[PDB]
Structure 1
């Protein structure tokens, strides 16, 4: 029984991750619909999370990390990957239906397995190449039938697969190396990442968008409602990422990506219902085949030498 309640405790982290992430995705897309500034919005989301984390430390509500030069050095690559994936995915969100962005990002486990096997010196059974056929075909069919398709929206989402996988792998290194450091709990690892990532993205966001005026592109929406929407999705952006690092603490980076693909089925189903996204038969079939393929790919990589 205790082993089962532990898995139920870990599974509950996954639920919270999915639950916060769905609330975030809906509110984030609604923010972008009336305030199309992906660079500044994504930077604000990191800043809100950075501020939230410092207050927890200041108030003594969260253990303060034993910060060292060795730890900051070991978090640069996790923060580089987080910043790039965050800015790329927000750009994708701003250009296409977010259901499509998540279809592209559903192939994350393949990038995760390749990067992890590269680092671990593992080899791939040839049958994993066979499972690439439905993955590549499914994404290609999904993109070719996606009504909101743009090349930049597709490529930024694909780039985020690479950035987040490096983040997850390098973050997993650090969490294992500092496993004895009782103060570096999972939330503190992500807390330091969102602080570093904020200053990493801030100069770029100011360069390409400056200071956008707080004006809704949807007529009739007050500035108070727009500001509230920015803060709301910024809060849940941080909460889902923070809880996800508890999940990352408990699984391998590849299992974390498999957990992300399961998350994305939920986000895709939820977002197309909330936004009444038009979906043709071929688009349904392409996206479903792509996601079946990445699961079969993970199944093949796991069950073969």
Structure 2
């Protein structure tokens, strides 16, 4: 029983990850529909999470990490990947329906398997190349039938696959290299990342968009409602990423990306219902084939030498 029970506590971390991420995605897109500034918004979300974590340390509510220069340097690459994937994903969110963004990001386990095998010196069974046929065909079919498609919205989402895979693999190194450091719990690893990531993105956000006026492009929405939406999606942005690093602490980077693809099916279904996103038969079939292909690719990689 304790073995299956331990998987229930870990599975609950995955549920929180999915539950917080769905609240984030809906509120984040509603913010972008009123306030189309992805650079500044994504930077705000990192800063709110940075401030939230420092408050927990100040109040003694969370163990303070024994920060060393060795750890900081070992967190640069996780932070560069997080910042780049975050800014690219928010840019995609601002340009297309978020359901299409998560379809593109559903190919993350393929990038994760390649990057992980490059590091671990592994090799791929030829059958994994066959499973790329439904993935490439599915994504191409989904993009060809997506009403909101733009080339920039598609490419920025594809970029985030590379950046987040880089984040997850390098973060996994740090978490294992500092396994005996009891103060570097999973939440503190992401806490330091979101603090570094904030200052990494901050100059780009100001150069790209400046200080956008706090005005809703949707007529009739007060500034207080716009500010509450910005703060609401920023709070749940941090919570879902924080809980996800608990999940990353308990699984491999590739398994983490598989858990992400399951998350995207939930977000895709939920977002098209909430937003009444128009979806044609070919578009549903294309997206479904691509995600089935990603699972088959993962199954082929896992079950073959």
**Which category describes the TM-score, using the shorter chain as reference length?**
over 0.9
Counterpart CA distance in 2 for 1:196 and 1:75 is: 8
Counterpart CA distance in 1 for 2:240 and 2:234 is: 10
Could you report, residue by residue, the CA deviation over 1:94-135 in whole angstroms, capped at 9, with x for unpaired residues?
000000000000000000000000000000000000000000
Could you report, residue by residue, the CA deviation over 1:70-97 in whole angstroms, capped at 9, with x for unpaired residues?
0000000000000000000000000000
Counterpart CA distance in 2 for 1:196 and 1:5 is: 36
Structure 1 residue 4: deviation in Å? 1.1
Structure 1 residue 197: deviation in Å? 0.1
Counterpart CA distance in 2 for 1:266 and 1:112 is: 20
| Number of the residue aligned with 1:20 | 20
Q: TM-score, normalised by structure 2?
A: 1.00
Structure 1 residue 247: deviation in Å? 0.1
Aligned residue-pair number: 305
Counterpart CA distance in 2 for 1:48 and 1:153 is: 25
| Number of the residue aligned with 1:165 | 165
Counterpart CA distance in 2 for 1:6 and 1:229 is: 36
Could you report, residue by residue, the CA deviation over 1:204-225 in whole angstroms, capped at 9, with x for unpaired residues?
0000100000000000000000
| Helix, strand or coil at the partner of 1:107 | helix
Counterpart CA distance in 2 for 1:292 and 1:49 is: 34
Q: TM-score, normalised by structure 1?
A: 1.00
| Number of the residue aligned with 2:55 | 55
Structure 1 residue 32: deviation in Å? 0.1
| Number of the residue aligned with 2:280 | 280
Structure 1 residue 189: deviation in Å? 0.0
User: Moved runs in structure 1, 4+ residues, more than 2 A?
Assistant: none
| Helix, strand or coil at the partner of 1:57 | helix
| Helix, strand or coil at the partner of 2:235 | helix
Counterpart CA distance in 2 for 1:176 and 1:108 is: 22
Counterpart CA distance in 2 for 1:136 and 1:2 is: 41
| Number of the residue aligned with 2:291 | 291
Structure 1 residue 170: deviation in Å? 0.1
| Number of the residue aligned with 1:192 | 192
Structure 1 residue 164: deviation in Å? 0.1
Counterpart CA distance in 2 for 1:2 and 1:61 is: 28
Structure 1 residue 231: deviation in Å? 0.1
Counterpart CA distance in 2 for 1:6 and 1:246 is: 13
Structure 1 residue 5: deviation in Å? 1.1
| Number of the residue aligned with 2:111 | 111
Counterpart CA distance in 1 for 2:114 and 2:222 is: 47
| Number of the residue aligned with 1:143 | 143
1:125 and 2:88 equivalent? no
Structure 1 residue 13: deviation in Å? 0.1
Could you report, residue by residue, the CA deviation over 1:132-153 in whole angstroms, capped at 9, with x for unpaired residues?
0000000000000000000000
| Number of the residue aligned with 1:207 | 207
Counterpart CA distance in 2 for 1:190 and 1:34 is: 29
Counterpart CA distance in 2 for 1:67 and 1:217 is: 43
Structure 1 residue 33: deviation in Å? 0.1
Counterpart CA distance in 2 for 1:43 and 1:293 is: 34
Structure 1 residue 28: deviation in Å? 0.1
| Helix, strand or coil at the partner of 2:63 | coil
Counterpart CA distance in 2 for 1:237 and 1:87 is: 13
Q: Which runs of 5+ in 2 are unaligned?
A: none
Could you report, residue by residue, the CA deviation over 1:199-255 in whole angstroms, capped at 9, with x for unpaired residues?
000000000100000000000000000000000000000000000000000000000
Structure 1 residue 2: deviation in Å? 0.8
